[PDB]
Amino acid sequence: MFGAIQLDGDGNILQYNAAEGDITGRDPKQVIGKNFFKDVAPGTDSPEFYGKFKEGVASGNLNTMFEWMIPTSRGPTKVKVHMKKALSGDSYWVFVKRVKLAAALEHHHHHH
Numbered sequence: 001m002f003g004a005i006q007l008d009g010d011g012n013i014l015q016y017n018a019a020e021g022d023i024t025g026r027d028p029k030q031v032i033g034k035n036f037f038k039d040v041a042p043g044t045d046s047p048e049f050y051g052k053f054k055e056g057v058a059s060g061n062l063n064t065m066f067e068w069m070i071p072t073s074r075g076p077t078k079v080k081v082h083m084k085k086a087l088s089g090d091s092y093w094v095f096v097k098r099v100k101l102a103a104a105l106e107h108h109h110h111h112h
Contacts, residue, residue, distance in 0.1 A: 005094045011035050061085050062092050067099055
């Protein structure tokens with residue numbers, strides 16, 4: 001379940017846009033209106049993840065980027081989760097992707 005979801009101050013899924021996908025045979029309304037921690041991700045109901053989402057809101061710039069383990073068809077798996085407050089300053093975008101060594105800003109390779 002990797003995609004870009006848009007949450008509000010309360011954390012309600014206002015819009016859902018799957019990513020790294022081509023087929024659109026998944027009822028989006030299933031998440032529309034529901035909370036990311038409500039059912040979309042019950043295991044993410046922790047202070048490290050959820051807590052940060054609410055904490056950042058108080059400041060008005062929820063900026064968090066880290067990896068989290070979520071349940072899947074083949075069991076629990078790690079994924080890159082990033083939460084950033086929208087530009088309007090009245091919402092937050094959630095980015096959940098697969099962890100495949102995508103992050104890496106080295107300075108130089110094959111050093112001698």
